[PDB]
Structure formats: C-alpha cells, structure tokens
Structure 1
Amino acid sequence: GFSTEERAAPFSLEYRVFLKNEKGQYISPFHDIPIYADKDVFHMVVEVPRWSNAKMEIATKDPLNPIKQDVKKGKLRYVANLFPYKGYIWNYGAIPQTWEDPGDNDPIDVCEIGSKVCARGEIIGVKVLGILAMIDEGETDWKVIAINVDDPDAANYNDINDVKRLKPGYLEATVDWFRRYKVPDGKPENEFAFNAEFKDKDFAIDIIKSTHDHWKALVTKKTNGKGISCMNTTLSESPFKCDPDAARAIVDALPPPCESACTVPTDVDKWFHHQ
C-alpha cells in the first residue's frame, strides 16, 4: 500500500519520514493520502506509536509534509511519562486531507485504541467510534477516537460506548492524559481552563467531514494557507500539484538513511507523579 522513506537518523534534528505510494512515488501524507480507505473506513497516518515518547507529527509547513520531530527552543521534544502511563497511551496521528481550520492548524488528531502497536509513518484504516471535545483555555481541541479496522476485535467496536464496554478505563485515562498534559499542575481551575466531553460516532464524522471541506478549500487555493505547504504529487484539481520526479529532489537532497539511531536523553525515562 504505502511505505516510508527515512532520511537521517531517528531522533536526530535532520530526521524526516516521507511517504511513498504503491509505486515508489513520494506523496504528502497531508494531501495525497485519500481521507477514505474504503466505505466507512478512514485513513490514518500514524505519527507516534503507542507507548513511545518522541513528539513526531506531519510537518504542515515543509514540502511534501514529512513526519518530523517537534522542536522547542532548539531541543527535540519528548512527551513526559505521566504516571502510571508510558508515553502516548494510543497510536496517535491524523486523518489525511483534513485541516482543523483556524482550530489547531493541522490535520485532525486521532487516538487509535487497537491492540497492535503501529509504526511511525504507517498508514492504517480505522473505524471512527467517537470524538473527544476539549476546551483548553478557551480553545477547542478535537481528538477522534478510532480503532484499526484490521484489529482482530474490530467488529465489536462501532460506537464510543463499545470502548466503555470492552476497554474499561480507557476513556477516563484519555481525559486524564490530556488534562495533565495541558495543565501540568494537574487540575484546572474551571471548565474554561480545561473541559472534556465525548461525543458519538455520527457527531465525530460530521466534524471530520467539516475539516475535510476546509482542507479542500486549502489545496484549491480558496483560503489563506497561513504558511501551510500545499505541494502535492497526486491532486489533479490542485494548482499546487508538482511532477513526482521533480518532487524526488526534495527527498534526495537530504541526508541519506542511517538506522544507527541517536540515543534518547535519559531524562525521557523519568516518571512524573501527580501530587
């Protein structure tokens, strides 16, 4: 289906993860992966495997939008181990061809709850089960809740109550994870500082389709891109389309693959307890 081309060493500053289609052509995971994998099955770009810490996401401003590691004041970012969790507690990522339009300014986020740990840059199909709406100091932050359609138990999951039923504690832990991530203190002062509520599958799909329409406007130049890189190699109706062979130079000009990988700071091991 899709595959990955990794440039430079993982957890280095130059590390990039580009996506390739069935034919070895470089494509943007933002723009060139269809939102739908099949009827009622959404594509998901996996950005971080469950239980990892590196904060890696689609580069919304880089040509071909490769996955790369976030950087804060010159240092590569890792999420904290929030006791009792190890790193991210879901496969975490995004639905391609969507754009929370400002809004967070990138593809709509997905928490994927299935049993398989997915790889960085892996493209999976997911069944949308619901959506977590969070108020973070007034702003709206959406997290789709989904499960790998290839999960052995996928047939048992069709709405958010199924998550409550067959994975007790998962939704609570999700809210807790995001609350302690956003308010490192622990508890916010009121529902403006942090609020959380889950909505069902139909609501989630309405939100997703809305962000897909916003993306449609983005890649057809009907809305200010606000710095988003819209270069793509497959969208026939997009003025930002570029010849695939021309786009290969974007990858080939970067350091070659090196899978003798940089070691992760020991500080990432530390576990932070809520007091």
Structure 2
Amino acid sequence: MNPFHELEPGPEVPEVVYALIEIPKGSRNKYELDKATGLLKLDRVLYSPFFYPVDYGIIPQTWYDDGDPFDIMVIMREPVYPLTIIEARPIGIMKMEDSGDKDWKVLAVPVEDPYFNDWKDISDVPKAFLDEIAHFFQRYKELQGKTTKIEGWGNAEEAKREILRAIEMYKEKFGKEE
C-alpha cells in the first residue's frame, strides 16, 4: 500500500504523527518518495559535502506549498532505513522558504525512544543543534544557484497548527486529484 496515499497522517494527529522517512541522517543523497509509484527515487546528490542532520521525510496524506508532501525531520540516534514509518512527536518547526515556496519542516522526536521522553518543545533541543539544522538548509543549495531563506524556529503549537493545514491541503488536492 502507498505510504503517502494509504498511510494516515498519524495515530493521534497532530500530537503524534507518522513520519515516513526518505533520507537517513548522514546521507548526502537526496531521496524522495516517487509520487507516481511509491518507490524511493534519487532526486539529486547534494552539490556540497553536507549530510542530512536528521532522518528526513514526509507526513503521509499531507500536501504543501512546494508541490509535495509536508516535510518532517525526526531526531533518530540510529538512523532508520528509507521508507520506514516512525511514530513521531512534533516539538517545533523550521520556518524555511525554498526557491520561493513556503517549505517549513516539522521537527519531531520518536515516541518510542526513551532518550527523548523529556523532549516536548523547541526549548528542549540544544541550541547548537537547531543552528546546525538551519545552517544546513541555509547553505546546502548554494552551488545549485537556488535561494533558500531560514526565518527561525516555531514552537510545538505552531508546528501542530501547520500539520493541520498540510492535512487539509492534501484533502483539497486529492479530493479532486487522487
């Protein structure tokens, strides 16, 4: 079953969502789910020797301003394999514009890693880690000649509100589309 159309957004939306991981932490290959088929696809190789600082993917049954599912970043100690489902607790949101599109990204922790039990909001994350994530998104497209802008971070409530918006964007798109 298609993990973008056929998985729900989460088991307890918006406090607990499913993250479908595309890119394990540590990868330079920018994988994306193929919308037509369900398979993992190489979108491109990053043009700089940078690596994704988080397990990176989508919330199923969401849509967003960049014409793709809403993006989620899960902090995993051991990275997962692509196309793994993680039950994830949103704790904040990175406010990014990407090539002119709103392209904000939920920051979340795995519900079922007790290391993160006390991580509940954006203030629980080491400041240098938030900075490292923002800096990656600030610079990783510089050699492609594409502009990104990072505004800062929102808290868990702002993240949850954005998840609800993205869920409605999917309904609107694929009530008529798929």
TM-score (norm 2): 0.89
Task: For 1:167-182, list aligned pairs within 5 A.
Answer: 167-182=126-141
Aligned to 2:76: 114
Tell me the distance in 1 between the aligned counterparts of 2:24 and 2:148: 28
Of 45, 56, 67, 2:40 maps to 67
Tell me the distance in 1 between the aligned counterparts of 2:103 and 2:154: 13
Relative to structure 1, the CA distance from residue 214 to residue 145 in structure 2 (aligned partners, 3 Å threshold; closer, same or farther) is same
Task: For 1:147-226, list aligned pairs within 5 A.
Answer: 147-163=109-125, 167-184=126-143, 194-221=149-176, 225=177
Relative to structure 1, the CA distance from residue 79 to residue 193 in structure 2 (aligned partners, 3 Å threshold; closer, same or farther) is closer
Aligned-pair CA distance for 1:198: 0.4
Aligned-pair CA distance for 1:193: 6.1
Say which one has the larger Rg. 1
User: Is the strand fraction higher in 1 or 2?
Assistant: 2
Tell me the distance in 2 between the aligned counterparts of 1:179 and 1:193: 6
Aligned-pair CA distance for 1:32: 0.6
Of 24, 47, 63, 2:22 maps to 47
Aligned to 2:61: 97
Aligned to 2:3: 29
> Conserved in 1, the CA contact under 8 Å of 2:134 and 2:150?
no
* Identity value in percent: 31
> Conserved in 2, the CA contact under 8 Å of 1:104 and 1:141?
yes
Aligned alpha-carbon RMSD (Å): 2.3
Tell me the distance in 1 between the aligned counterparts of 2:154 and 2:20: 22
- Residue 107 of structure 2 corresponds to residue 145 of structure 1: yes
> Conserved in 1, the CA contact under 8 Å of 2:137 and 2:150?
no
User: Is the helix fraction higher in 1 or 2?
Assistant: 2
